Structure formats: structure tokens, C-alpha cells
Design a protein around this ligand. Structure first.
Ligand SMILES: Nc1ncnc2c1ncn2[C@@H]1O[C@H](CSCC[C@H](N)C(=O)O)[C@@H](O)[C@H]1O
Length: 265
């Protein structure tokens, strides 16, 4: 009820409140909008970056926790080639429900097939799409509530230390300021083994992203601020990349995207 003037749920605090992600984040619209253009170009670039990290570089191990998975599984497709077990997490219940629809292969679930086929092509067509989605489904062990602003982001859910914490397009959305952002990155560290990987992909200098006409706050960090927060949260950056490709103005006012792979100090 600020009617676009300001992101939804931000009128008082200046950033979209977390209760907004339980109310107004509609996973189906979210999926319809970004994951069915500038949006598909970004998706391609994320997919190729994830392929490279997990399949070409040595980002490998036993357990990966995906932080702020949303209703989406495209971030996990190359990861399952490299990680025995995957935990997907998100603050929004409706997102977790959408994920569980997908995991059970409910007919009512979102069709990921063309994104799955694209990952298969990237991976050299060793298998086709249906075989790949099913390897991913069996790799996904847990679907949990996450709050990255909490020092136990997963609460009392016991999990062994992870080899990788992944987070795509989430931290910008979740963190109203840079102290919270740095704190969230430290929080995610609590889940990682000594020297575990941390993989973040997110938008640069983006202050909102739309779901159709629903406006959500994003933390408008540049490259230097991202680098600073990662370092202070107790990590050594292995590689950091920035692309200039942006979403359409009608989805986000971002100036490019970043991806990084860091290790816990
Ligand atoms: N405090 C918080 N802790 C964990 N997740 C949060 C959060 N606040 C917002 N989120 C989540 O962050 C996600 C941002 S949209 C990104 C979703 C998906 N990873 C993708 O790549 O497209 C949403 O799923 C939203 O529910």
C-alpha cells in the first residue's frame, strides 16, 4: 500500500520487511517472470557460471546448502554433479512448498525442462533432461526454513558442516544494510567446515526487483562493498567476476551481476 513509490513493506524501515516474503512473494509469479529476453540471458549466464564453478573448477564435496533457494532449482543442476547431498532453504513457506511440489514431481509444479536441457547441453549431453532432474531430486535431502539474519540461520536443525554454502540472488534481498549483509555471511559460515566454499551470485547496484508489479527491496551494493563484506565475514575470495548484463528496467534497476567463490578463513 505504498503503491510502487517504495518497495512493499519498506515504508517504515526503508527495506522490505521479512514478513513481506511470507505475504506477497508469490512463487508462481516469481517463476513465471524470471525463469520461464534480458531475464533468460542472465539465467544463461548464471547456469554457465554454476557449470564452471561446480563442473570445471574444483568446487566439490559431500554437502552443499543452498541458502535462500526461493522456488528455484536451476542453481542446483550442475551442483549435484559435484555434491553428494544438497539442502535447499528459504525463509518463505510458500517457496518451500513450491520446492517440495517440484521434488515430488507434482503435476502442478513448475516446468524446469528447458533449463534442465540447457544444463545437460553444457555438461556435454551425457544424459538427457529427465535423467538429470531425477539425479537432482534424489540429491535434495532436506528443504528447510532459513533466516540468514539469525546466528543459527537454520535454527536447531542439526546438520554436519557443509563443504559449500551456495546463495543465488538472495543476500541482496535479505539484507537491509551492509552490517546485516556482513553478519549474514558470518552466519552462513557457522554452517561451513573450516575452509569450506562459499558461492554467491547476485545483482550489483540494485535497489529493487519486481515480481510483475510487486516491488521488493534489494541492497544496492557495488563490487567493492561485496568484496569488503565477504572478507570481513571471514573469507578468502578465490575468484570474483562482474558482468555488465542487467535485467530489464521493468524487473530490476541493477547494473550487472557478480559471482564469487570464497573460502572460510
Ligand atoms: N532473511 C532471509 N533469510 C533467507 N531467505 C530470505 C530472507 N529474506 C528473503 N529471503 C528469500 O530470498 C529469496 C530471494 S529471490 C531468490 C530466489 C532463488 N535463489 C533465485 O535464484 O532466483 C526469496 O526466496 C526470499 O524468500
Amino acid at each position: 500500500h505504498s503503491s510502487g513509490l517504495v518497495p512493499r513493506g519498506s515504508m517504515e524501515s526503508g527495506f522490505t520487511s521479512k514478513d513481506t516474503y511470507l505475504s506477497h512473494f508469490n512463487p508462481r509469479d516469481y517463476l513465471e517472470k524470471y525463469y520461464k529476453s534480458a531475464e533468460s540471458q542472465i539465467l544463461k549466464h548464471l547456469l554457465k557460471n554454476l557449470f564452471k564453478i561446480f563442473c570445471l573448477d574444483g568446487v566439490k564435496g559431500d554437502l552443499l546448502i543452498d541458502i535462500g533457494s526461493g522456488p528455484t532449482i536451476y542453481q542446483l543442476l550442475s551442483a549435484c554433479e559435484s555434491f553428494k547431498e544438497i539442502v535447499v532453504t528459504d525463509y518463505s513457506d510458500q517457496n518451500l512448498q513450491e520446492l517440495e511440489k517440484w521434488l515430488k514431481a507434482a503435476p502442478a509444479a513448475f516446468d524446469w525442462s528447458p533449463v534442465v536441457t540447457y544444463v545437460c547441453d553444457l555438461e556435454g549431453n551425457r544424459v538427457k533432461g529427465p535423467e538429470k532432474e531425477e539425479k537432482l531430486r534424489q540429491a535434495v535431502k532436506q528443504v528447510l526454513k532459513c533466516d540468514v539474519t539469525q546466528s543459527q540461520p537454520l535454527g536447531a536443525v542439526p546438520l554436519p558442516p557443509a563443504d559449500c554454502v551456495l546463495s543465488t540472488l538472495c543476500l541482496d534481498a535479505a539484507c537491509p544494510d551492509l552490517p546485516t549483509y556482513c553478519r549474514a555471511l558470518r552466519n552462513l559460515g557457522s554452517l561451513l567446515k573450516p575452509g569450506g566454499f562459499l558461492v554467491i551470485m547476485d545483482a550489483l547496484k540494485s535497489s529493487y526487483y519486481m515480481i510483475g508489479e510487486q516491488k521488493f527491496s534489494s541492497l544496492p551494493l557495488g563490487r567493492e562493498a561485496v568484496e569488503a563484506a565477504v572478507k570481513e565475514a571471514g573469507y578468502t575470495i578465490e575468484w570474483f567476476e562482474v558482468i555488465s548484463q542487467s535485467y530489464s528496467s521493468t524487473m530490476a534497476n541493477n547494473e550487472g551481476l557478480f559471482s564469487l567463490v570464497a573460502r572460510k578463513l
